[PDB]
Design a binder for this molecule. Sequence first.
Ligand SMILES: NC(=O)N1c2ccccc2C=Cc2ccccc21
Length: 128
Amino acid sequence: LACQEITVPLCKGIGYEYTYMPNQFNHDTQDEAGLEVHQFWPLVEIQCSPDLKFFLCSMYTPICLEDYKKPLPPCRSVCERAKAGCAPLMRQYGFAWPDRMRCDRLPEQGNPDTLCMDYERLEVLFQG
Ligand SMILES: NC(=O)N1c2ccccc2C=Cc2ccccc21
């Protein structure tokens, strides 16, 4: 609802400055979100996907903008790239791709009414 400076260490400097609560992971605060997203640090560090960190942050500390007041998700493609790189390694060690991160419930780019986010390199790109 109101924008707050991102305070999750993993997500600081990710390409956007502000987040909001609640997220879609049943977190009311960044402290709660930070405790869950920190558990992914080994996968971030092993670099199974250059997109994993941006994807994680875009979900757990979603972007907050002053001039767009609708939830703004990562585009489905960001999720698909992160999943393609990292889900096989995750399965090998007994971890499923989390249901809340199912890429098919994220919107595709080009939507007439709403936006979604990708990035280049780190600069956010809105593609809608
Ligand atoms: N909070 C939301 O409604 N969205 C949306 C919005 C439109 C479509 C799917 C989704 C799914 C989850 C999600 C994740 C991050 C940021 C926003 C967000």
